Every structure is written in structure tokens, then in C-alpha cells.
């Protein structure tokens, strides 16, 4: 009781020193204390469910969809299927079910996985801050990673909340992802939404700029090798000198376009490489998260009208015909009334 509190207190401090140690092969940290169990729980349940789960009544109409490999799927068609529309947004842990058999029929695995997964990646983001602080780095890698985290959160949590059901969250599978995208286009015209267009500029541009930056640095590597060696051996890990001639690279790119379209400042250049895809993904995540509340893409259906009043179709009206085809066919047994209002 007396000095025993100090033997407990230094033991706590030893644990804190181990948790926050810069010398663990994989950094643990306080965020890792939450991240490690939740990612393991989500991974284990996902792998078992993807292989072996029985069919799931995703749309609450006693029409179970098979997602697992053992129940007739391959890698492309398989999924962990979202929880039942009868559940809606209700919290459905294992212990709310009368049995594992019931839990499986109703899509319990989906909720367990997405909730542990989302805790896990939020803590993964915090952990990226934490290690940078322990290493004496600047802190903002976690801000770049907030873009994919925002996007995952949009499709697994925000969109279900707005629509009132985790049955409308993105399925954990390849063909289930495409299903989510197609129904999303039918119900929100996401292609005509400027935040998704920014998303596309973000990833098309990110891929462009990745190839550009990669090619320009590779183009100006300083000769340190013979023709029978990979040029990669011309760089030694941790060397102080830069390994390419950025003056040569800038001299190329400034003539490819014009001088002032080219970065000569490596810090400005690398900030741009970070900001462009990150901002594009932020906006497309916000697109999903605001179409979650049914503020949808631009609607120019029948916007062009002739002198008499006849509609003159545009390409927007052709898009509308494709959206209609998906609208009228999706969840073909689930609607009883004329409007799909969520």
C-alpha cells in the first residue's frame, strides 16, 4: 500500500515506455493500443466470412444473397454482404441475436467488420501523427491519409446514416462495390456532381503527376553505374548528396511547356504532389457524404426546349435513360410504392 504504489507506478511507466518506444519494429503507440485489436477482429471476421458465411438477407425481404466462396462465389463475385434492411441503422452485435445462425442470416458480420475497421483506420491515422511526433518529424502525413479515411467513412457509415440503413453501405466485395456504384449513379447522378468530378481530376491528376515526377527524376539521374548495372545501385541509402540533377530536369520540363510552368523548388513541387490528390479525394468523399443527404448531381433532364415546347435531348438526357434502366431494375422485389425515397 505504501511504496507499493510506486512499484505499480514505475511498472506503468515501463509499459508506457514500451508502448511509445521508437525502437519497436512496428510502432505500437497509444493509438496502436486501440488499432491493433480492432483491425485484428475486423480482419479475422472478414476472412472467415468471405470464405464461409451463408447467404445474407441484405434488403430485408427474405431474399438472401450469397457472398462467400464456399457458397458459390469466386474472388470477383464474393463479398461480405451488408446487414438487413429490416435492421436499418439499429446496432446489431452478436449478443443481440438469438443465435449465430440468426446473426449470419441478417448480416451481422458486416456490422462487426465495418465498425472495427473504421475504428482501426481512424487510429491508424492517429498513429501516423504519433510516430512522427516521436521521431521529430513534421506532423502532416496523417492529414494526407485523412483523405482515404474520409472516403471509407463516407461509403461505410455516412451514406448508410443518411439513407437510414447499413443495407445501403458499400458491400465488402469486388462485384458488390460495382453494385453500390451503379445504384448510386441511378439515385444521385454522381457523374454529374462536381465533387465527384473533382475526385476524378484528383486521381487522374495524381496518376499523371506521379508518372510525370517519376519520369523527370528518373530522366536526370547522375551517372554512377555502368550499362550492365541497374542505375538504382547509383544511389546509396542515406547518402547526403542528391542523386539527380534537378537543374537538368527543370531545364527539360521548362522547355516542354514553358519555363514558368515548371517547379524549380523541390519543396513547392512535393507540396503540390501531396495537395492535388488529397484535395480531390477530400472533395469526392464529401460528394458521397452529401449525396448521403440527397443533394445530388446536376439535373439537366429536358433543359433544352425548342420554340414549340418540344424537348431537344442532350447527352444529359441519354445519361438519364441509363439511370432509369438501373433505377427500375435494382432490388426488383423491394419496392411496393412508386417512388424510391431512400
Amino acid at each position: 500500500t505504501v511504496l507499493q504504489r510506486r512499484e505499480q507506478l514505475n511498472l506503468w511507466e515501463q509499459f508506457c515506455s514500451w508502448v511509445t518506444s521508437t525502437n519497436n519494429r512496428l510502432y505500437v503507440g497509444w493509438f496502436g493500443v486501440l488499432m491493433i485489436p480492432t483491425l485484428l477482429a475486423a480482419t479475422i471476421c472478414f476472412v472467415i466470412a468471405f470464405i464461409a458465411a451463408p447467404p445474407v438477407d441484405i434488403d430485408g425481404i427474405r431474399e438472401p444473397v450469397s457472398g462467400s466462396l464456399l457458397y458459390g462465389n469466386n474472388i470477383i463475385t464474393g463479398a461480405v454482404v451488408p446487414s438487413s434492411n429490416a435492421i436499418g441503422l439499429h446496432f446489431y452485435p452478436i449478443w443481440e441475436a438469438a443465435s449465430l445462425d440468426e446473426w449470419l442470416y441478417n448480416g451481422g458480420p458486416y456490422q462487426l467488420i465495418i465498425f472495427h475497421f473504421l475504428i482501426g483506420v481512424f487510429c491508424y491515422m492517429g498513429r501516423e501523427w504519433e510516430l512522427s511526433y516521436r521521431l521529430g518529424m513534421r506532423p502532416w502525413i496523417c492529414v494526407a491519409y485523412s483523405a482515404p479515411v474520409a472516403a471509407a467513412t463516407a461509403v461505410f457509415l455516412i451514406y448508410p446514416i443518411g439513407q437510414g440503413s447499413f443495407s445501403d453501405g458499400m458491400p465488402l466485395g469486388i462485384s458488390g462495390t460495382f453494385n453500390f456504384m451503379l445504384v448510386f449513379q441511378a439515385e444521385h447522378n454522381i457523374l454529374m456532381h462536381p465533387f465527384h468530378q473533382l475526385g476524378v481530376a484528383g486521381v487522374f491528376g495524381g496518376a499523371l503527376f506521379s508518372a510525370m515526377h517519376g519520369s523527370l527524376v528518373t530522366s536526370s539521374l547522375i551517372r554512377e553505374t555502368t550499362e550492365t548495372e541497374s542505375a538504382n545501385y547509383g544511389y546509396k541509402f542515406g547518402q547526403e548528396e542528391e542523386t539527380y540533377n534537378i537543374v537538368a530536369a527543370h531545364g527539360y520540363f521548362g522547355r516542354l511547356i514553358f519555363q514558368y510552368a515548371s517547379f524549380n523548388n523541390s519543396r513547392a513541387l512535393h507540396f503540390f504532389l501531396a495537395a492535388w490528390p488529397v484535395i480531390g479525394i477530400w472533395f469526392t468523399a464529401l460528394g458521397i457524404s452529401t449525396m448521403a443527404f440527397n443533394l445530388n448531381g446536376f439535373n439537366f433532364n429536358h433543359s433544352v426546349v425548342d420554340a414549340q415546347g418540344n424537348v431537344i435531348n442532350t447527352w444529359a438526357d441519354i445519361i438519364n435513360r441509363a439511370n432509369l434502366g438501373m433505377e427500375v431494375m435494382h432490388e426488383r422485389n423491394a419496392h411496393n410504392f412508386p417512388l424510391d425515397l431512400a
Binding site: 447467404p55 431474399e63 438472401p64 450469397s66 458459390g72 470477383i76 463475385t77 464474393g78 463479398a79 512522427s132 513534421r138 502532416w140 502525413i141 494526407a144 482515404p148 462485384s175 460495382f178 453494385n179 456504384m181 449513379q185 457523374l191 454529374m192 484528383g202 495524381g206 496518376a207 503527376f209 506521379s210 508518372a211 515526377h213 517519376g214 527524376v217 528518373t218 539521374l221 538504382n232 544511389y235 541509402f237 542515406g238 542528391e242 542523386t243 537543374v247 523548388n265 523541390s266 519543396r267 513541387l269 512535393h270 507540396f271 503540390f272 504532389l273 501531396a274 435531348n313 441519354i318 445519361i319 435513360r321 432509369l324 434502366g325 427500375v328 431494375m329 422485389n333 419496392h335 410504392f337
Partner: protein
């Protein structure tokens, strides 16, 4: 017009199912990932090379020294992700390799679609579903969406065919 082209390729070619398009997607998204992560990593392993709180001025184009710490960046990603770049030349070649290879793979898939040589179906799926009306997957769900796209979009999208689809033949689920 391009958005229409995307949806045409879904409804008629089932192009999302095509592994060459999937490799294209991986290269585009992987390239955007590399763009973001590399830019962010450089900007957050910078050496303090000036006194300003805005750090862009502390770089000199003719300088010999790296402006950021490869050693600290490598340890960070090794401990966060398990692996990290150690070779700056490999890093920048890989940033070329990934999106360039992805776009090349997507082009190969489109060449197949020129001939309607689609990844449209999985035969084993169709044999099972035809014989077993309780068997349903996300793959069969998406084909129904495709069948809707074709029937609802073709009369206006392919006017030279003079399609007239009486309302009774249009595929539709309940109510909608």
C-alpha cells in the same frame, strides 16, 4: 457525352468486370496514392534549412544536399506500414511504372471490347443461377442492372436502329 460512354460500357460490355480495367483502376488509384504519399513524406521529413515557419524559402535549386531525410522517412514507414522505400531511384521509377502500366492494361481491355470480346459473364455462375432460382450474388444483381441499361437507353442512344420497345417489354422490378 463521356459519362454516357462509361454507362454504355457498363450496360453493354460489363466493363467493370473486366480484369484489364481492374488493373487500370489499380494503376490510376495506386498512382494517385504514390503521388500523395511521396509529396506528403518529403514535406514532413524536411530538414530545418532556414528560420521561417513557412519552409518553402529554405530550399536552393543548386544545393548538393537532400532537402528531406530519407533515413527518417524510411524508419517512419518501416514502423507504420512494415515496409518503406530505401532507394530514391527505385522510388521515382516506381512512380512512373505504376500508372503507366495501369493505363496500358486498360487499353488492352478496350481492344478486346472493340470486338465485343468482353468479360461479360462467369459461365459457372449462369449455369447455377439458371437451375437454382434461390441462388443470388452481386454478380447476378449487376447483370439485371445492365439489362435495364440496355433496354431503357438503346432506343434514344441508338436512333439508327429505330427501336420501338412497347412498354410491356421493358424490364422493370416491382412498382418502379
Amino acid at each position: 457525352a463521356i459519362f454516357r460512354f462509361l454507362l454504355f460500357f457498363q450496360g453493354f460490355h460489363n466493363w467493370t468486370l473486366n480484369p484489364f480495367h481492374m488493373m487500370g483502376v489499380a494503376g490510376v488509384l495506386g498512382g494517385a496514392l504514390l503521388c500523395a504519399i511521396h509529396g506528403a513524406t518529403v514535406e514532413n521529413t524536411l530538414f530545418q534549412d532556414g528560420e521561417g515557419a513557412s519552409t518553402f524559402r529554405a530550399f536552393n535549386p543548386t544545393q548538393a544536399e537532400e532537402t528531406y531525410s530519407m533515413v527518417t522517412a524510411n524508419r517512419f514507414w518501416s514502423q507504420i506500414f512494415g515496409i518503406a522505400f530505401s532507394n530514391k531511384r527505385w522510388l521515382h521509377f516506381f512512380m512512373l511504372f505504376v500508372p503507366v502500366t495501369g493505363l496500358w492494361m486498360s487499353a488492352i481491355g478496350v481492344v478486346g471490347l472493340a470486338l465485343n470480346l468482353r468479360s461479360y459473364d462467369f459461365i459457372s455462375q449462369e449455369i447455377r443461377a439458371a437451375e437454382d432460382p434461390e441462388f443470388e450474388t452481386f454478380y447476378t444483381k449487376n447483370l439485371l442492372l445492365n439489362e435495364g441499361i440496355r433496354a431503357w437507353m438503346a432506343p434514344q442512344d441508338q436512333p439508327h436502329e429505330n427501336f420501338v420497345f412497347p412498354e410491356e417489354v421493358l424490364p422493370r422490378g416491382n412498382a418502379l
